[PDB]
Paper text:
To understand the structural basis of DSR2 anti-phage defense, we expressed the full-length Bacillus subtilis DSR2 protein in Escherichia coli BL21 and determined the cryo-EM structure at 4.15 Å. This structure is referred to as the apo DSR2 tetramer to distinguish it from the complex with the Tube protein (activator) and the DSAD1 (inhibitor) bound structures reported later. In this structure, four DSR2 subunits assemble into an autoinhibited homo-tetrameric assembly, forming a ~ 480 kDa bone-shaped supramolecular complex. Two DSR2 subunits first cross over to form an X-shaped dimer, mediated by the SIR2 and MD domains. The tetramer is then assembled by arranging two such dimers in a head-to-head orientation, facilitated by the SIR2 domain. The DSR2W143G/Y148G/Y552G/V556S/F559G/N563S mutant with disruption at the dimeric interface behaves as a monomer, whereas the DSR2I259S/Y260G mutant with disruption at the tetrameric interface behaves as a dimer. As expected, in the absence of activator binding, DSR2 showed no detectable in vitro NADase activity. The same arrangement and similar active sites of the SIR2 domains in the apo DSR2 tetramer and inactive ThsA suggest that the apo form of DSR2 represents the inactive conformation of the DSR2 complex. In contrast to the “loose” structure of the apo DSR2 tetramer (~256 Å in diameter), the DSR2H171A-Tube tetramer shows a more compact structure (~226 Å in diameter). Without phage infection, the apo DSR2 tetramer in cells adopts an inactive, loose conformation with its N-terminal SIR2 domain in a self-suppressed state.
Residue numbers in the entry:
A (entry chain A): 4 to 1005
B (entry chain E): 15 to 637, 642 to 895, 897 to 1005
The structure:
Amino acid sequence: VDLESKRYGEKLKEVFLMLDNNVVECIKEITESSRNGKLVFFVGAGVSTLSDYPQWWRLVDKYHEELYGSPKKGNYSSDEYLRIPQIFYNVKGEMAFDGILKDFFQVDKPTNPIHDKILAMNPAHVITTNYDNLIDTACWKRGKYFSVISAEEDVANATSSRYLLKVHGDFRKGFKGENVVLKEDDYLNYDQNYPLISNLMKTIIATHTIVFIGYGLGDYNINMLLNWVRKLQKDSFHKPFFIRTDPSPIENETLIYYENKGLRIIDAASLIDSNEYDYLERYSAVMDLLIESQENKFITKDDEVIDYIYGKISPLFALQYIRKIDLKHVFEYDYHFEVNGTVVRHKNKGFGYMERFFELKESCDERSKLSKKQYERFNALFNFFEKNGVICMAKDAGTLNTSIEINSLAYHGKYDVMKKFIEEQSVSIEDDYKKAFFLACLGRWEESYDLYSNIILNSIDESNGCVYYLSQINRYRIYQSITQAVTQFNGLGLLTFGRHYKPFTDEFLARIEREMTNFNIDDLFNGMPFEFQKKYKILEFLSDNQFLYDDTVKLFELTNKVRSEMSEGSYSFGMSSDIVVLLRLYDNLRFLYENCLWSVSFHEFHQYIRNSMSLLIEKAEYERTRDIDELGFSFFGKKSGFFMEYYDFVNISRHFKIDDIKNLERSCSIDKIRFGEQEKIEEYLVGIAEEITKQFSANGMNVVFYTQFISEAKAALYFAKYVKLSEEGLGKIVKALLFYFPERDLDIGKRYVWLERLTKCNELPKSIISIIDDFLVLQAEKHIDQNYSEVSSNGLYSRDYGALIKHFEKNFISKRLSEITLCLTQDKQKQIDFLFKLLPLLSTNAKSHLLSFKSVENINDLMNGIRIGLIDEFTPEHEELIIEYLETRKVNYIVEKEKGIQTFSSNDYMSTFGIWYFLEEINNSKMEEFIGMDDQYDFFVDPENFDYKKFIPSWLKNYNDKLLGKIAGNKHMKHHVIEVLKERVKNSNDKRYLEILMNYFI
Amino acid sequence: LKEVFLMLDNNVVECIKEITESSRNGKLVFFVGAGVSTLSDYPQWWRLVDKYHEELYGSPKKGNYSSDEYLRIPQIFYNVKGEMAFDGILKDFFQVDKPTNPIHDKILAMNPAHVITTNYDNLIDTACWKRGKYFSVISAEEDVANATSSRYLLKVHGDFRKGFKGENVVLKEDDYLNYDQNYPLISNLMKTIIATHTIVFIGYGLGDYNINMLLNWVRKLQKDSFHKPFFIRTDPSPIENETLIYYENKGLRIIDAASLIDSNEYDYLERYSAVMDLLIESQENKFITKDDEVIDYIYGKISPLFALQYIRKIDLKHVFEYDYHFEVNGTVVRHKNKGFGYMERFFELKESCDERSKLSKKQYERFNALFNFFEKNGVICMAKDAGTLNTSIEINSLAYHGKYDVMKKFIEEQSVSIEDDYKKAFFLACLGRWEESYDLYSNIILNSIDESNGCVYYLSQINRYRIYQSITQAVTQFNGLGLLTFGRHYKPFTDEFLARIEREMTNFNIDDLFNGMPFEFQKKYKILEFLSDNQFLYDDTVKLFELTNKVRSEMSEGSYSFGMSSDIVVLLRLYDNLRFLYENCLWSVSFHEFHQYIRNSMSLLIEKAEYERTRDIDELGFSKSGFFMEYYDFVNISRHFKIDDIKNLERSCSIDKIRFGEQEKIEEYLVGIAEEITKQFSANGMNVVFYTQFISEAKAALYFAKYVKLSEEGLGKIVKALLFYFPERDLDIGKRYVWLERLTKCNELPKSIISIIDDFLVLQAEKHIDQNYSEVSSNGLYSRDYGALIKHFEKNFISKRLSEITLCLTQDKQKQIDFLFKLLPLLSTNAKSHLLSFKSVENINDLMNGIRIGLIDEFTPEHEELIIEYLETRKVNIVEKEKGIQTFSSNDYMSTFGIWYFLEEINNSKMEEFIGMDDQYDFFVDPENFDYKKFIPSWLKNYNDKLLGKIAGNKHMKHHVIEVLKERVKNSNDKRYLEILMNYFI
């Protein structure tokens, strides 16, 4: 029945079952040639009769009609077919011939389905013998582009790589018989008149498998080609195939003779009985057999149910750990794989081979029927499939529990084992390539390039050649890498390096420039063995810089497409299952194709993958803080998802930068984000500590290695505040943090800030304190030279640098520093000032010995003591000393009033003077008679009578030391004061005012 | 080099250009001889023939070996001794190793397509290992069908790689005379290769028999259509002209080495190095030294595609091999150009007409065409001497503006030009989601292949494929949910369309279209590869739109005086998006999964940049950008955003304080959309295929207000769109009320709008009088809200449409008159008196309505006792058994009860006898003991008067009530929380 595979389905399956060996092997060869892109068709004129095109015998009958007046009775002789027009051309002239041709050919007919049927079989080249554009129009409307060749200049002006030859020429240049082979003299002088076309046809016969179609035995062209081919050794010639839809069965003797001639005959009459006029039916039946040959994978006890997949997957065994999504390209999108491991039959027609493969896989029984070789193939394929992580059929879903593991030592950074594995002797070529990739990203790119050259020297012997492609790609990429490396080194100059660390002598630069010049990377795209090209098609995007450039675009689009829903704080229900963040994490962890890569972290644009995916994972806090601003459910615990593991920590340390970490923590609560694996991360941090300790203990030619490892420490240590280190590793991490980091990279201020954050996150009971004291002592002997100074980004203060230690232990005194103080004299004033910084942690004897050095003789020295903290509470003698100056300021205030200006920008001590009186540090009534000098003095000395017309909330920037907390309970007019804050908050967008509106208000 | 090049102007400078062009296209093919072997010091043939002469004749060659003597003399030996002597002699003279000369390496460096070596050797074969190039070697006919790779290394006379025996190589004259018979499969291949490729002879004998046969063949059959080959003459003595002109008439051109350099006779290496170095330049720099260079090397590259009106700025960087950085602003600068500054020359020649006068007339016209093309795209000057490049962005396409009547007018009109047919097809795709004639694209295909214009077939195929995908997606949407969503099985597409499109689109070559297109299409229009594969492809969708992620990370600004608005944020974020709005105004925007969304990622940072510049400087009026959002950006916002997007924008961004430009244009656009939706409500049926998305646009316009002052008529028309013209499925009564309240709330509500609202109420009353229809409000907004909205903004609002119905009521049913019962305060005095006489108020709903509007707030003890009895019924509903009866969200009146408490709307404290079941709302009777998060901040910002002048927290719960508000404002982002904090009390 029509529109159903009845004559196309079961009966053709039975016919294929009863087919002989010759026909089935011809079908297999045809399918192989088609799938290899090495198939060329030879279209005859017979199919033209299927479209009701005018026939040549009709034309010659016409010519005889107007030649002798009456047509010749009976069937015309074959020779006359090429003889009657010639005489007609000799005497009647050209005009009658042209008129008849234009009368009988200026018509158009629709294209028969056989045209597109043969066209939809990826034919590389098509050789025709006709006088129209029926096949041209068919491939035209189908969409395929073919370059029509019918003249010598057409051969000369070649434009594409798909040829549609015209053995006798078309009628593009007019309806003239001179340019179209139609006469016997043309058949005699074809070689002389058209040498180029003939030579091209002879060349194209040998290179491909010629499949004749729409031809009858005895035609002149076929006989001529057979005569040509018989004048050959035929030692390595491929016998062409023939299609012949005769209504009557073929005699066996003729079959034997033509098989001996060198043609393999496929008969359509022997297929099924049909009417003598059903040529279209026979042609369509042949087409349907050769098309159904695709989805003709019948299943038996011993069959291709494992062999087909074995053939499809066998080349891929060379690679270590391929991606799940890439498999969709292997199976020509017959299925669609999921990152979870399920496989769904989408966009598939025919037989579900994957389903039967599964049914064999899970079922222990019903498998002994397979052959032992098939059993081994099944075992190998099952091992490969279980290695990748494909779980089961999409129908048999559930219990989706999977993890991610990486085996490369580069990921974990075991540099000791790294080098240890580096030294040993070579064994084979694969381990040489692996150790060559290992040799890079370590600071010895010279030897890495040399080993890549050595591998590429003798890699053609490889059975698969994938190692050849990978080595070539890595060589190209390392060439660019060293190019930009030397460019950046020239750009930095001596600013970054104390001495310009040239990676290598310019001779190597010259030889690599000569080697790598004019090297456009095409490889598989244009030239590489066709056997490799038909397979391994998933490595086609490797021609770019990174090993995933073309495959990163889908992630770039999909991250936004899924941010369309995972990043919006309006909804508060909370997604239950099929969490998009988990599948995004699975997808990006799948991209850790670390078994076979090159310097993916080096590519600045590659790490953006990590720099964006985890960023959006954290920006998914919109799903958090839900049901807190909304009713929602009863769960009011601010605990988001993303239970990050060791791998997430490693990725954040590897790719995220310190500034980006600050940006993300500006608007997140990772402090509240919980995470497991409290022990492995400690080991990773410790290993980083020994690596940085060994590197900086005796620095050498590690500048190439000292470009990414240095950035690793910044990300690792700063982020480590979130995790809770054990006290045992805290000592090692502090030792690494303090002594062994470079001084230029980290000043005192940043080291102090990071030390403060680790101390706040994890306490320091007794052990780390000794290390801090030792560092303080070492700084003390550093300050021996007065000329010695250090640059601080945020502050050179050592007050807090030691006040932190005093905070840990109130009763703390440094005995070693005490003796250091005791063994000094009044010659090194900078050392005296530094010991002044260290006064709280010094012993009483040290204080007594040091105070004999410097003292307060004037007021300014007394306030200079306030700057350094010499005298926390000065004696009443110093109180009245200020009063004498305050009286001196008082009498000069009248003089300054007469001057017409107020000089309070410098010596702004009255604001400080009123601080102590307001702090109740000084209890005297003398200061009140000096009222009115300064607005700050008014606001502190007499807060109950001051005038707030000054309107200066900007002082709140410097009221951290004012101890606003004490004032908060001591403001005489809190209500008047807060109205300023309300106005300032409304009329200013600064956040400092918002801080005071909280730290010390409501 | 250049010093010698000064005189290289005699059919040499153009020959180098032609050879380099052939190399670029891959048509270049070498043909190496025996000279390179001599450079590698390979054994010479004359030594072998001298040895053979000594073997038989005796004594060395007293005379000289003639041409024939070089061939027949060994053959005679073959006729007197067996092949073992030949094998021994060849082994003695050939079992040697020779170093690979640099000539082989440089020959590989020029990267040819095919190599044809006539000499028997492995030096060139071995040299491929060092470069790594892979070649398939063809020794003879035995290995032809085993074509390993496209690259070929053909051995004309075989080789001694397996040529230990004498039969594997042809050297004797007997083999030469019957060479074709012995090796037929090689001669034809050589002929077709030299016919279909550019062939260059290097280091090759001029008088050799092989070139003799070649020449006697090529000019014998071909006269004028043959491309003349290239030959390199490397001889010490300089060549003369009579032989040269004789060879030119033969059909072969000559490039001698003597003209270039004449260092020494023996320094063949020097001559070969010079002649190859003259080609090493590869036509990448200093190819020509003439003037008027702004007419060549650019015109053939910058204007083969001028049929496309618009070109993106980022595209021109790919056009010129990234030699210049084309900024989004419109300036350029050299990046990788190494030579003459042709762009610099063009910029200099643009203005100075004095030096333009000397330009050739046709060259002048081409220069003016290039100038017009550049100024149309937006390139005006160079980054070296240019400042700001802020320019108004405009669109010429009518689809992006929203015109529809002229759209139909053009659709009715026929189109003759192929471009006009493309425009018509695009416009039809705009009007109808599925083209009733997608065969218009087939006509585009056939006409484009008919014509020689090109670059129309390629685009139309992509458009057709995208249309196919969209139609299949529409079919998927029209699943079982589609039938109920649209009311019934509409099935706009019929089955035969699917049947034909599935059979046409099957096995489509979406992998790549450049393979189908010839080489010239791929090379010239390489700029179309951005959307060619379009299989989630790059640099057309997100690759430059992923750059905004970096700015998203660069959002953080130090201190307070930085600015994300008065900055370069317009560069690469605003102008980049505006440039990428249309690439050619004809590409199908039909796909909406990514583009319309990523349009809301844009216009998002810009909106967040509207922080009123309060932190940029002290005064919010910074006084520049201005950010007057003109109508194009308004269209973007009202086209690509959703309801919830704009909702969360209004949550924590400036909305009303921002002013938009082109307000009259916005008025025109809104009036047009309202008029066309009203017409289409009557013009046709659902036409869901266009309706489904289009209504979204309408919605995005209605709730986007408080921006323009609507004209009296237009507002009257736009509110008329709400007069039962919008489908009630999308907008119920509650949503209509909300959007109506949002509109005009900043206006004074003229009397025409009041009459329109009264008419709406009249139609709703007619619907209610049906006695069967029941009001449907998802948000609980009853029809009385319109009555509450009116008369609360105006006075003396009274209508004669419905009061007469109340007076002339037949006292039939209360259900159909519940609308009038609720609207009692708006009713006429006599009518309301009659209605009051007809129906009293006793039910809890009646009491709620009476307190809400009309009647009286305080009530008799029996009424509050009835409310207590309702509370007792809620007490019984004890029988909940945790089966959903405990949920009380559907009936929202328990909280309303507590609203009367704490507001002195009670006569006794009997509610204390009923413990509040609503855990959300119970603290009104037990303020001291409240459940954790009893008060949800959403409910906190809901009401406005229960603060009652801040006494809500002043009477009790003074402290630990601002903690929740403050932590909400600290973590979340809402202005309402800040205002609640400002009043300091709940």
